[PDB]
């Protein structure tokens with residue numbers, strides 16, 4: 001198997017559907033799915049603790065070092081609720097999943113988030129923080145917002161991205 005394969009970033013507020021989409025994409029394309037939070041947990045890539053948010057702080061440099069070789073080889077779908085620290089060269093396309101605030105709140109409430117965590121996350125979405133972070137970090141032409149409210153939308157997202165992957169592979173393996 002000697003094909004050039006693309007790298008895809010799935011970003012957006014926690015709860016929007018990144019993991020659901022990334023896992024389905026991996027199963028249906030054979031690309032490797034990487035959950036950055038899970039990777040950080042497995043490889044213990046943390047430095048410091050945030051007092052106000054009550055969470056260990058992701059060690060961004062170590063995450064980058066951990067992933068770099070694999071990213072260089074291509075064919076990776078990366079899922080994280082942040083994107084400014086990734087090398088720009090990693091990604092061929094970046095999707096920012098978006099979820100209506102009312103819908104997102106019900107999802108995050110079901111997760112058992114307390115009030116402070118619910119509020120911070122919900123404001124993150126309503127202020128469009130990750131969308132702005134993606135646009136600030138990557139070329140406008142490769143950043144796309146995806147609706148992620150209903151199963152029908154997940155289905156459309158899977159379909160559109162699978163079609164994009166197929167076209168990209170053709171274009172970069174002449």
Ligand SMILES: Nc1ncnc2c1ncn2[C@H]1C[C@H](O)[C@@H](COP(=O)(O)OP(=O)(O)O)O1
Nearest residue numbers: 014015016017018019020148149150151154
């Ligand atoms: N497009 C969609 N329509 C309806 N429910 C969705 C959806 N995408 C995800 N979900 C559900 C699955 C989970 O119960 C919840 C959060 O999904 P997720 O994949 O864990 O989000 P994230 O990885 O962005 O935090 O929403």
